[PDB]
Amino acid sequence: QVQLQQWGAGLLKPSETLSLTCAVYGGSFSGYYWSWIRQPPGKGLEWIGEINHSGSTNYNPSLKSRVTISVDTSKNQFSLKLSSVTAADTAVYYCARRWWLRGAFDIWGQGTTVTVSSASTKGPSVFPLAPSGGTAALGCLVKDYFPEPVTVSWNSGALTSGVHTFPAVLQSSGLYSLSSVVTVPSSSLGTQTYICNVNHKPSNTKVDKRVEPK
Amino acid sequence: NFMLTQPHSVSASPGKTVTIPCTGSSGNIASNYVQWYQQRPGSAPTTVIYEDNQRPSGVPDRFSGSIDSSSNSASLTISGLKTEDEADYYCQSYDNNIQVFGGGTKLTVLGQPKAAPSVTLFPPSSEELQANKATLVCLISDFYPGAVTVAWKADSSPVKAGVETTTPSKQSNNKYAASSYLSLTPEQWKSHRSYSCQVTHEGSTVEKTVAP
Amino acid sequence: FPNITNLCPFGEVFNATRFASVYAWNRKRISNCVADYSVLYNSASFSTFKCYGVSPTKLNDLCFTNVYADSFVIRGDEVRQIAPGQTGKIADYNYKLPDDFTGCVIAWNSNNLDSKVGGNYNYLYRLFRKSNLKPFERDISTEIYQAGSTPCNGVEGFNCYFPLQSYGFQPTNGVGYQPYRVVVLSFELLHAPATVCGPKKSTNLVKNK
Ligand SMILES: *[C@@H]1O[C@H](CO)[C@@H](O)[C@H](O)[C@H]1NC(C)=O
Ligand SMILES: *[C@@H]1O[C@H](CO)[C@@H](O)[C@H](O)[C@H]1NC(C)=O
């Protein structure tokens, strides 16, 4: 029966103001508790604040200094403003209903991903990692770029066996960082060649480079 | 003030029973109701227990809640595991006009043999040492379940700064991988005799080392 | 449905000026009235609020023969014991709930009302009995408890103790040693007609359709 539908601008940059809206279908605001909840990427749930039955606000004291929740009863609609955002405000945001003060969150909106980032397009730069192990596991660091994706091939594409690209780390500075490794039948020059080979279409930056013992 | 804490991850093979704890601190957990939510990846949470013992309509009788006013603890039991029970589980309660959530527990339903993280570590690249930079690269692969954690120890000291690290993610062969990057100047790299990466995984531990 | 009128006396229970000692707990009987439980269950004032055998989501549309409100003062640490199947000096010797209790336990901290500097010794509890209370029993007996093997003369002495202690409620006590005022609501159905019911909601009156 009751449905929560939410929308708002997801991509933002530091010191902007977030502005999310949630609307209720098949039901009405007046008898129930309505909350905003967020979930940072790879982290647990945090409750931001609520509207009670009849429309008074209550806020989490950690966010109370910069947050504002309000209802437009003419539209069965309510909203979150969260002012002067930082990269730490990057999360999925849910509106949710609760039936009484201490009850369960019984209905949830579909979520809305908010990304707070100043970043602009930047091609990768590449830094070789010298070989390791008896079987040769040898590596290559693709240290700072934005946005995703990237490709970190080897030997001009001649070496597609034993390759491992890890997932990229989104750093605190808003740029990504990536390692590619290949494990090879062990030799210094007995492989077809010995190069790490990057292409980055968001900038068209392309670095083809040697990887070898020190 | 009041806080709920849960283990980061739990695992058992299908057909077994698991208990997820949720411990109260700076207050007593029995004073108000406890809910439990399941969250399957890329979707909103759903309640599986809605007052300390009580299960919603359409939730399997395999899920049961309990509470203990002597241990200051709640717990969720899932009995007769299925591979569909693999999700995050969050406990929640009310105190002092705030809704508090526990940190969440990843449950994995153990559909493969346990495997230790294979780990690789590299020195900072000379092309960083040229122009005043350095990245130590610690890489983690082929662990199961997907539950590693990482630390860095220099030659004989915890470094713990500029140490950004992925969440664990799936791999070809259906096991998991992760990576961690430790950030230095070439001088701070020379300041220590060696550097080491420690990885720890469901009680087990791996250690690996490089040096200038 | 008719106008919401004749609301139950919960204000006389929860906002009484003077509460009981836990050994001599008061009981009020609530009957023949409209119980809006919403003014209780979604109040932010209470430190403890929970119900047994009923969800608050299913109050306001249930009916009962009678409701009893039982009320007293205890330490904040002892509020733990006011639940089904518990044990300790309060549960064992002062106020016992059934294991199959249907009802709500509500409590709030009251060190602003009924604690004072140099202590408020006007609140007491039984420290001793020859046996545990049965459910909803009270015992206001004052007879000196013979604790040891020696036959007591009926007056205080070695191995023979006065049965009530008093709470040392200083305003600076740690949170577990503060006073808490407690109300236990017990709900019952007999073969008599129901007399306590939740408020009946009404729509507007539409005509010619
Ligand atoms: C019911 O309440 C309305 C609104 O206050 C009032 O106008 C009406 O006279 C009342 N009727 C009865 C029978 O109490
Ligand atoms: C007790 O008094 C307060 C303040 O006047 C009031 O808000 C509250 O509703 C009363 N409690 C009950 C159960 O009536």
Side-chain angles (χ1 to χ4, degrees):
Chain A
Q1 176 55 19
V2 182
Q3 170 185 344
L4 278 55
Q5 184 77 15
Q6 49 172 116
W7 61 87
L11 180 62
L12 301 174
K13 78 202 68 67
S15 75
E16 290 197 64
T17 291
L18 175 67
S19 295
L20 301 183
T21 295
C22 174
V24 179
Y25 305 129
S28 180
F29 273 67
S30 60
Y32 309 105
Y33 284 71
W34 303 92
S35 303
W36 287 90
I37 298 161
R38 69 179 184 176
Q39 184 170 31
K43 299 294 186 290
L45 293 156
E46 173 173 50
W47 172 83
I48 299 176
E50 74 194 343
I51 282 284
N52 74 352
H53 68 285
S54 83
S56 301
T57 51
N58 169 41
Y59 301 125
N60 185 320
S62 65
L63 293 175
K64 183 170 69 173
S65 58
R66 68 182 181 114
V67 76
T68 292
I69 298 169
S70 67
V71 189
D72 188 353
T73 52
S74 77
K75 280 137 60 190
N76 286 295
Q77 180 177 114
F78 89 123
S79 65
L80 171 75
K81 279 70 57 167
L82 188 152
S83 63
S84 299
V85 302
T86 66
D89 296 311
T90 297
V92 183
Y93 288 73
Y94 311 91
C95 56
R97 198 189 76 163
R98 197 202 313 137
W99 196 96
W100 67 289
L101 178 68
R102 319 183 192 231
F105 291 107
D106 61 355
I107 311 183
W108 295 72
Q110 90 288 354
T112 296
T113 303
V114 171
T115 300
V116 182
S117 182
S118 58
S120 63
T121 67
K122 184 172 181 177
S125 294
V126 184
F127 302 84
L129 309 172
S132 71
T135 194
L138 59 86
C140 187
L141 177 69
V142 179
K143 187 167 157 55
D144 277 306
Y145 67 96
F146 181 93
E148 284 274 288
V150 67
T151 303
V152 190
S153 68
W154 288 81
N155 291 357
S156 304
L159 181 61
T160 63
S161 184
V163 177
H164 195 189
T165 50
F166 291 78
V169 168
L170 176 58
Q171 302 161 117
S172 188
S173 309
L175 302 178
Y176 299 101
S177 199
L178 169 66
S179 301
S180 189
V181 180
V182 65
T183 309
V184 302
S186 194
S187 184
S188 182
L189 303 101
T191 53
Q192 317 81 10
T193 179
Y194 29 70
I195 52 178
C196 171
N197 296 113
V198 178
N199 179 44
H200 184 255
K201 290 195 300 185
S203 69
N204 304 103
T205 302
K206 183 172 179 287
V207 174
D208 296 305
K209 215 79 185 78
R210 278 162 30 68
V211 188
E212 194 167 33
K214 189 60 55 65
Chain B
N1 294 19
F2 176 67
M3 281 180 62
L4 299 177
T5 64
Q6 297 178 234
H8 179 67
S9 57
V10 169
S11 189
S13 45
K16 278 56 174 177
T17 295
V18 308
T19 299
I20 304 181
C22 172
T23 298
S25 60
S26 203
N28 193 304
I29 198 166
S31 189
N32 292 283
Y33 294 121
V34 181
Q35 288 74 245
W36 291 85
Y37 305 91
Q38 178 190 73
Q39 189 184 22
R40 193 166 284 114
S43 71
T46 56
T47 169
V48 297
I49 297 294
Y50 91 83
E51 291 165 15
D52 313 349
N53 310 308
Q54 294 296 330
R55 178 167 55 263
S57 185
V59 177
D61 299 324
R62 297 189 306 110
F63 292 94
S64 58
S66 88
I67 198 158
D68 176 357
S69 59
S70 76
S71 304
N72 199 7
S73 190
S75 71
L76 176 70
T77 303
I78 311 93
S79 59
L81 259 57
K82 302 215 217 83
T83 201
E84 60 173 325
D85 301 330
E86 173 160 302
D88 291 0
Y89 294 85
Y90 298 93
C91 60
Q92 180 255 314
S93 195
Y94 172 100
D95 196 16
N96 193 25
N97 234 25
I98 296 169
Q99 314 305 116
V100 303
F101 287 92
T105 298
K106 177 66 179 190
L107 173 61
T108 52
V109 180
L110 194 80
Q112 183 171 11
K114 290 171 181 273
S118 64
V119 176
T120 310
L121 169 64
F122 300 102
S125 187
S126 186
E127 288 86 339
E128 307 178 273
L129 303 178
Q130 301 146 227
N132 308 87
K133 293 180 182 179
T135 311
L136 282 76
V137 177
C138 184
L139 307 177
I140 308 95
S141 48
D142 303 67
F143 48 105
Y144 187 80
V148 294
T149 58
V150 188
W152 293 90
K153 189 156 51 70
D155 47 9
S156 186
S157 285
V159 184
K160 218 188 71 174
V163 158
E164 58 272 14
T165 290
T166 75
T167 194
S169 183
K170 279 299 212 304
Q171 194 180 343
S172 181
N173 86 23
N174 219 349
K175 302 182 182 178
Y176 289 85
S179 61
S180 296
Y181 300 95
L182 174 149
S183 312
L184 299 176
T185 70
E187 300 304 314
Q188 293 158 357
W189 165 242
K190 295 286 185 175
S191 296
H192 291 272
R193 185 168 292 282
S194 60
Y195 279 83
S196 311
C197 180
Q198 284 203 349
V199 183
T200 185
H201 169 55
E202 301 293 4
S204 73
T205 303
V206 176
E207 171 76 289
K208 185 68 66 174
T209 303
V210 294
Chain C
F1 293 114
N3 279 339
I4 302 304
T5 48
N6 183 38
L7 291 165
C8 293
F10 296 134
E12 301 194 331
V13 173
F14 285 84
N15 295 324
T17 57
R18 194 184 189 93
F19 267 51
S21 287
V22 69
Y23 84 93
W25 52 271
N26 292 153
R27 171 163 279 190
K28 182 157 189 157
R29 181 179 171 272
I30 306 293
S31 187
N32 309 88
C33 60
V34 177
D36 183 14
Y37 306 94
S38 183
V39 311
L40 306 182
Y41 63 69
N42 67 41
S43 181
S45 182
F46 309 127
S47 175
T48 301
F49 183 100
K50 65 194 309 190
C51 306
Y52 302 88
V54 290
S55 286
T57 61
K58 296 183 181 179
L59 299 179
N60 280 42
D61 64 13
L62 251 53
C63 288
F64 301 108
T65 303
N66 279 175
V67 180
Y68 304 99
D70 308 335
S71 66
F72 47 83
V73 181
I74 56 177
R75 284 167 65 256
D77 177 35
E78 280 153 17
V79 184
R80 187 202 311 258
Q81 302 181 26
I82 311 303
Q86 292 292 334
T87 183
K89 299 300 177 182
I90 303 308
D92 300 3
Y93 299 160
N94 293 269
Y95 184 83
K96 185 73 189 184
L97 293 84
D99 299 343
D100 67 339
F101 174 61
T102 62
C104 302
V105 179
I106 307 94
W108 61 102
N109 187 202
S110 66
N111 87 321
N112 62 317
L113 291 168
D114 61 7
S115 174
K116 73 192 305 291
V117 68
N120 181 19
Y121 302 105
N122 293 290
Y123 295 117
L124 297 102
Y125 66 104
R126 313 196 73 79
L127 184 60
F128 309 115
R129 298 193 86 233
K130 297 178 180 177
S131 59
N132 295 0
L133 259 56
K134 282 156 286 187
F136 306 126
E137 179 172 20
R138 88 163 63 71
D139 186 1
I140 68 177
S141 315
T142 297
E143 182 194 34
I144 310 303
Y145 172 74
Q146 182 200 313
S149 304
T150 309
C152 183
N153 302 102
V155 69
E156 301 167 52
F158 178 66
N159 271 331
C160 189
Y161 307 144
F162 186 87
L164 316 175
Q165 262 298 357
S166 56
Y167 292 117
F169 295 141
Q170 315 290 349
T172 53
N173 278 1
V175 184
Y177 289 80
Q178 302 276 25
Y180 277 66
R181 283 152 99 112
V182 183
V183 178
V184 184
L185 299 182
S186 178
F187 309 129
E188 72 174 1
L189 280 160
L190 293 312
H191 288 81
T195 82
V196 185
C197 286
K200 301 293 174 67
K201 291 293 191 175
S202 298
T203 67
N204 299 91
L205 176 64
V206 59
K207 298 201 303 183
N208 320 289
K209 295 189 178 185

Coordinates of all heavy atoms in Angstrom, one line a residue, chain A residues 173-206:
Chain A
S173 N 41.5 12.7 -1.0 CA 41.6 13.8 -1.9 C 40.7 13.8 -3.2 O 40.8 14.7 -4.0 CB 43.1 13.9 -2.4 OG 44.0 13.9 -1.3
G174 N 39.8 12.8 -3.3 CA 38.7 12.7 -4.3 C 39.2 12.1 -5.6 O 38.3 11.8 -6.5
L175 N 40.5 11.9 -5.9 CA 41.0 11.1 -7.0 C 41.1 9.6 -6.6 O 41.3 9.3 -5.5 CB 42.4 11.7 -7.3 CG 42.5 13.1 -7.7 CD1 43.9 13.5 -8.0 CD2 41.7 13.4 -9.0
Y176 N 41.1 8.8 -7.6 CA 41.3 7.3 -7.5 C 42.7 6.9 -7.6 O 43.6 7.6 -8.2 CB 40.4 6.6 -8.6 CG 39.0 6.9 -8.5 CD1 38.3 7.8 -9.3 CD2 38.2 6.1 -7.5 CE1 36.9 8.0 -9.2 CE2 36.8 6.3 -7.5 CZ 36.2 7.2 -8.3 OH 34.8 7.4 -8.3
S177 N 43.1 5.7 -7.1 CA 44.4 5.1 -7.3 C 44.3 3.6 -7.5 O 43.4 3.0 -6.9 CB 45.2 5.4 -6.0 OG 46.6 5.2 -6.2
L178 N 45.1 3.0 -8.3 CA 45.0 1.6 -8.8 C 46.3 0.8 -8.9 O 47.2 1.3 -9.4 CB 44.2 1.6 -10.1 CG 44.2 0.3 -10.9 CD1 43.4 -0.7 -10.2 CD2 43.5 0.5 -12.2
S179 N 46.3 -0.5 -8.5 CA 47.4 -1.4 -8.8 C 47.0 -2.5 -9.8 O 46.0 -3.2 -9.6 CB 48.0 -2.0 -7.5 OG 48.4 -1.0 -6.7
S180 N 47.9 -2.7 -10.8 CA 47.8 -3.9 -11.6 C 49.1 -4.7 -11.3 O 50.2 -4.2 -11.1 CB 47.7 -3.5 -13.1 OG 47.5 -4.6 -13.9
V181 N 48.9 -6.0 -11.3 CA 50.0 -7.0 -11.1 C 49.8 -8.1 -12.1 O 48.7 -8.4 -12.5 CB 49.9 -7.6 -9.6 CG1 51.0 -8.6 -9.3 CG2 50.0 -6.4 -8.6
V182 N 50.9 -8.7 -12.5 CA 50.9 -9.9 -13.3 C 51.8 -10.9 -12.8 O 52.9 -10.6 -12.4 CB 51.1 -9.6 -14.8 CG1 52.5 -9.0 -15.2 CG2 50.9 -10.8 -15.7
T183 N 51.4 -12.2 -12.7 CA 52.3 -13.3 -12.2 C 52.7 -14.0 -13.5 O 51.9 -14.4 -14.3 CB 51.6 -14.2 -11.2 OG1 51.0 -13.5 -10.2 CG2 52.6 -15.2 -10.6
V184 N 54.0 -14.2 -13.7 CA 54.6 -14.7 -14.9 C 55.5 -16.0 -14.7 O 56.1 -16.1 -13.6 CB 55.4 -13.7 -15.7 CG1 54.4 -12.5 -16.1 CG2 56.6 -13.1 -15.0
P185 N 55.6 -16.9 -15.6 CA 56.6 -18.0 -15.6 C 58.0 -17.3 -15.5 O 58.4 -16.5 -16.3 CB 56.4 -18.8 -16.9 CG 55.7 -17.8 -17.8 CD 54.8 -17.0 -16.9
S186 N 58.7 -17.6 -14.4 CA 59.7 -16.7 -13.9 C 61.0 -16.5 -14.7 O 61.7 -17.5 -15.0 CB 60.1 -17.1 -12.4 OG 60.8 -16.1 -11.7
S187 N 61.2 -15.3 -15.2 CA 62.4 -14.9 -15.9 C 62.6 -13.3 -15.9 O 61.6 -12.6 -15.6 CB 62.4 -15.4 -17.3 OG 63.6 -15.0 -18.0
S188 N 63.8 -12.8 -16.1 CA 64.0 -11.4 -16.2 C 63.7 -10.8 -17.7 O 63.1 -9.8 -17.8 CB 65.5 -11.1 -15.9 OG 65.8 -9.7 -16.0
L189 N 64.0 -11.6 -18.7 CA 63.7 -11.2 -20.1 C 63.0 -12.3 -21.0 O 62.8 -12.1 -22.1 CB 65.1 -10.8 -20.8 CG 65.8 -9.7 -20.2 CD1 67.0 -10.2 -19.4 CD2 66.4 -8.7 -21.2
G190 N 62.7 -13.5 -20.4 CA 62.1 -14.6 -21.1 C 60.6 -14.5 -21.4 O 60.1 -15.2 -22.3
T191 N 59.9 -13.5 -20.8 CA 58.6 -13.1 -21.2 C 58.6 -12.3 -22.5 O 59.7 -11.9 -22.9 CB 57.9 -12.2 -20.1 OG1 58.8 -11.1 -19.7 CG2 57.6 -13.0 -18.8
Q192 N 57.5 -12.2 -23.2 CA 57.5 -11.6 -24.6 C 58.1 -10.2 -24.6 O 58.9 -9.9 -25.5 CB 56.0 -11.5 -25.1 CG 55.1 -12.7 -24.8 CD 54.5 -12.7 -23.4 OE1 54.6 -11.8 -22.6 NE2 54.0 -13.8 -22.9
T193 N 57.8 -9.4 -23.6 CA 58.5 -8.2 -23.2 C 58.1 -7.9 -21.7 O 57.8 -8.9 -21.0 CB 58.1 -7.0 -24.2 OG1 58.7 -5.8 -23.8 CG2 56.6 -6.7 -24.3
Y194 N 58.2 -6.7 -21.2 CA 58.2 -6.4 -19.8 C 57.7 -5.0 -19.5 O 58.4 -4.1 -19.0 CB 59.6 -6.7 -19.1 CG 60.8 -6.6 -20.1 CD1 61.2 -5.3 -20.5 CD2 61.4 -7.7 -20.6 CE1 62.2 -5.2 -21.4 CE2 62.5 -7.6 -21.5 CZ 62.9 -6.3 -21.9 OH 63.9 -6.2 -22.8
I195 N 56.5 -4.7 -20.0 CA 55.9 -3.4 -20.0 C 54.5 -3.4 -19.4 O 53.7 -4.4 -19.5 CB 55.9 -2.7 -21.4 CG1 55.3 -3.6 -22.4 CG2 57.3 -2.3 -21.8 CD1 55.2 -3.1 -23.9
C196 N 54.1 -2.3 -18.7 CA 52.8 -2.0 -18.1 C 52.2 -0.8 -18.9 O 52.8 0.2 -19.2 CB 53.1 -1.6 -16.6 SG 51.7 -0.9 -15.7
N197 N 50.9 -1.0 -19.3 CA 50.3 -0.3 -20.4 C 48.9 0.2 -20.1 O 47.9 -0.5 -20.1 CB 50.3 -1.3 -21.6 CG 51.7 -1.7 -22.0 OD1 52.1 -2.9 -21.9 ND2 52.4 -0.9 -22.7
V198 N 48.8 1.5 -19.9 CA 47.6 2.2 -19.4 C 46.9 3.0 -20.5 O 47.6 3.8 -21.1 CB 48.0 3.2 -18.2 CG1 46.8 3.9 -17.7 CG2 48.6 2.3 -17.1
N199 N 45.6 3.0 -20.5 CA 44.7 3.9 -21.3 C 43.6 4.5 -20.4 O 43.0 3.7 -19.7 CB 44.2 3.2 -22.5 CG 43.3 4.0 -23.4 OD1 43.6 5.2 -23.6 ND2 42.2 3.5 -23.8
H200 N 43.3 5.8 -20.5 CA 42.3 6.5 -19.7 C 41.4 7.4 -20.5 O 41.7 8.6 -20.6 CB 43.1 7.3 -18.6 CG 42.2 8.0 -17.7 ND1 42.0 9.4 -17.6 CD2 41.4 7.4 -16.7 CE1 41.1 9.6 -16.6 NE2 40.7 8.4 -16.1
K201 N 40.4 6.9 -21.2 CA 39.5 7.6 -22.1 C 38.8 8.9 -21.5 O 38.5 9.8 -22.3 CB 38.4 6.7 -22.6 CG 38.9 5.7 -23.6 CD 37.8 5.0 -24.5 CE 36.8 4.3 -23.6 NZ 35.8 3.5 -24.4
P202 N 38.6 9.1 -20.2 CA 38.1 10.4 -19.7 C 39.0 11.6 -19.9 O 38.5 12.7 -19.9 CB 37.8 10.1 -18.2 CG 37.5 8.6 -18.1 CD 38.5 8.1 -19.2
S203 N 40.3 11.3 -20.1 CA 41.3 12.3 -20.5 C 42.0 12.0 -21.8 O 42.8 12.8 -22.3 CB 42.3 12.5 -19.4 OG 43.1 11.3 -19.3
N204 N 41.8 10.8 -22.4 CA 42.7 10.1 -23.4 C 44.2 10.0 -23.1 O 45.0 9.7 -23.9 CB 42.4 10.8 -24.8 CG 40.9 10.7 -25.2 OD1 40.2 11.7 -25.1 ND2 40.4 9.6 -25.6
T205 N 44.5 10.1 -21.8 CA 45.9 9.9 -21.3 C 46.3 8.4 -21.4 O 45.5 7.6 -21.0 CB 46.1 10.4 -19.9 OG1 45.8 11.8 -19.9 CG2 47.6 10.3 -19.4
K206 N 47.5 8.2 -22.0 CA 48.0 6.8 -22.3 C 49.5 6.7 -22.0 O 50.2 7.4 -22.7 CB 47.6 6.5 -23.7 CG 48.0 5.1 -24.2 CD 47.4 4.9 -25.6 CE 47.7 3.5 -26.2 NZ 49.1 3.3 -26.6

